[PDB]
Symmetry: C2
């Protein structure tokens, strides 16, 4: 009894732009959105750069009063969520509002808000904690606020699976629709971790590039001189719709979401298995889910974080799943341009996977100057590659050995 | 091909006990776990009491070296998870590990760790932030660390739906099993929010009881003089198992999980609608999901937080859904005794709803001295009521207007 799920709406904030067609222009032109951070003093930090959303005006979306109650990550997820709903042309009615849900997640949630309230608490005591500190900081408040704003009475939840969050949110929402629990879902992720604790936390884990002299060159997935990931901010939301609901209202359809894989590695808290066994199981489950032979995959949007162990583990995973086909598909990391939006990474990379299908073009991996040992696949170095893409795959893995794979197909 | 799902294992840390049987004895005896908070100086705070886990020894489960790097919510989540898996008698093998997953959630996760690291950041500087801060504090690391310790390679994720988290984590895991994505899932939630930001934050929102003179009488759901909820910490975990998988290995089955409802209110960020329309919609979805006549419901474990608005919304929902049968069923709030474990509230209350079925007894609502206007149902005031229970329901509501209902049935 499994219903087909298609994408009818997309919304985005990224370091490359304030919407989807600005971010995508940047992806195809191979631009970086990485720069020295301007909103705080990082003198004592070992990393001083990352991907900020530049020029965000929350009052295009909310009243000043509404915005003052919400952490930036929630502001960001609402912006991308409202763009996606507008993009879909969906009309919410008394007849359909219990068939429309939301699954917007985040990896690290209201860390920035918690920092600012912590400063007030330490400087002047608990009477200075904002009344809205709790509702304004918790990860489900993108789902909560969106559903209250639009009157959505379908499944209302949030995933938090670290750097896998966006991929899991989109996949579980697909499941909701395929198994008849909803007809429409808004899904994706938002992240704003560019605070003392985020740069300091990930930096204490020795997980960040320290290439402070050349921020636009720091993120270089599968390059021999990679030294960790680049911390970035933003959001991605997709409108997922049962196929016949989309066709019934004359919705423009971007792609079909055919396959979803999850699988734990059970390996280590913060490092992947070098052999890519985790990504491997997950991609295979996603392909089984889609009813697709590995040889039908044309494009992979890699997780490709620019860490030493992560990048090579992903090459191994792909070689295992795809055998000889590995040298026929294209794989790239848009994190080379966007940096790592953590729990939003899978959301914005789903969108880029969908636009690779719409536009028949593999986005580049910029800064891929000297591919490392074993990195001999078509990694689309430096420049966008026009090619045939009928099937795009998007991979995410996260802390705690969490893995997510989405399979999208062109459809005409 | 929707498969049936049973409970084969349960685990818990609560203000009444360091396991299920100790906690349940507390519940049936009408014992309060609420006491003045010992682990900090709260003289500047308007709320100075709550439910602590008392005498918790993480070394009954994990080495000192590991435990030291984990926030209390992760220690609580792992303890409950390990209890539930031992209680199930399940053996993890190469033949099944890919069919066993985990969904242990939290409302806000690593708040104590975040506060302590903020202190380090503001007094000392970023070089004093723990390298284990991110993996030891983020919400998906109960799922992550449990997969790593036991070798679980099934679906690995975490929900964060505020005070609804433990109910949704259980329900969605059951959906995973129902649709073939897993045969076994460890599901529930864990919370430790008893720090400056938690008491200060919920206090600033004016959500907390301020009955400092009488802590054990502060939590009084449906009582006229209720003045906000009581903040508690802990964890609940269930082993969910496909029925033929349970039968095949001859497992002890506690109950069947026959229904799961979700719904957004789409009303307000921190307040329910007075009529409880979201709770009503959620319970109706759950009962329809279970294929039951509403007159089959014998026992409701209410969300019942002791907030002025929440308690009366939930009587209105129960009147709307069950009509005259609202006067035949028993409804109680175990939060009268445990207080509010937030993201874990739905986990520990699921376990109490299953034990109500095993032991044919409705837990009491303690402190119900003066039922408020319209609170004219059997709310099991003061003392446990032995009675027939074939079907038990557990309700959860959260900030963001998130709702979830679980329906359990004696297995035969
Ligand atoms: C235990 C070790 C060894 C160490 C050495 C090599 C490395 O590459 C890093 C820096 C990062 C590993 C990794 O890719 N994790 C890792 C992962 O498993 C899953 C997701 C991500 C992500 O960024 O989304 C990620 O980053 C690790 C982390 C920590 C200290 C240095
Ligand atoms: C907007 C208002 C009005 C106000 C007036 C009387 C009240 O009863 C409270 C205190 C609590 C509302 C409520 O139960 N929320 C509420 C909710 O929707 C969902 C879950 C819970 C829970 O604890 O699990 C919860 O607590 C509200 C909260 C805030 C300030 C005072």
């Amino acid at each position: 009894s499994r219903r087909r799920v298609v994408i009818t709406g997309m919304g985005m904030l990224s370091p490359l732009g304030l919407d989807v067609p600005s971010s995508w222009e940047g992806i195809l032109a191979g631009r970086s959105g990485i720069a020295p951070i301007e909103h705080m003093d990082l003198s004592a930090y070992s990393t001083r750069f990352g991907g900020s959303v530049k020029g965000f005006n929350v009052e295009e979306y909310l009243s000043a009063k509404e915005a003052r109650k919400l952490d930036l990550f929630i502001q960001y997820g609402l912006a991308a969520s409202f763009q996606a709903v507008r993009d879909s042309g969906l009309e919410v009615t008394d007849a359909n509002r219990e068939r429309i849900g939301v699954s917007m997640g985040s990896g690290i949630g209201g860390l920035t808000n918690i920092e600012n309230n912590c400063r007030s608490l330490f400087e002047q005591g608990p009477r200075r904690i904002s009344p809205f500190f709790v509702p304004g900081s918790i990860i489900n408040m993108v789902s909560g606020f969106l559903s209250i704003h639009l009157g959505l009475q379908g499944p209302n939840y949030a995933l938090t699976t670290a750097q896998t969050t966006g991929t899991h949110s989109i996949g579980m929402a697909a499941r909701n629709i395929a198994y008849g629990e909803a007809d429409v879902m808004v899904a994706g992720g938002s992240e704003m971790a560019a605070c003392g604790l985020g740069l300091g936390g990930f930096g204490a884990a020795r997980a960040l590039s320290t290439r402070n002299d050349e921020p636009t060159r720091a993120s270089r997935p599968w390059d021999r001189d990679r030294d960790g990931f680049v911390l970035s901010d933003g959001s991605g939301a997709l409108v997922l719709e049962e196929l016949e609901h989309a066709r019934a209202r004359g919705a423009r359809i971007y792609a079909e979401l055919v396959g979803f894989g999850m699988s734990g590695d059970a390996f280590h808290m913060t490092a992947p298995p070098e052999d890519g066994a985790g990504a491997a199981r997950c991609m295979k489950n996603a392909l089984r889910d889609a009813g697709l032979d590995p040889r039908q995959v044309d494009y992979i949007n890699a997780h490709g974080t620019s860490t030493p162990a992560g990048d090579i583990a992903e090459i191994a995973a792909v070689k295992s799943v795809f055998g000889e086909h590995a040298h026929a598909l294209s794989m790239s990391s848009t994190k080379s341009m966007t940096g790592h939006l953590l729990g939003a990474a899978g959301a914005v990379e789903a969108i880029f996977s969908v636009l690779a299908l719409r536009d028949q073009v593999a986005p580049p991996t910029i800064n891929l100057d000297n591919p490392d040992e074993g990195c001999d696949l078509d990694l689309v170095a430096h420049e966008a590659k026009p090619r045939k893409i009928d099937v795009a795959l998007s991979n995410s893995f996260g802390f705690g050995g969490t893995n997510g794979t989405l399979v999208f197909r062109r459809f005409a």
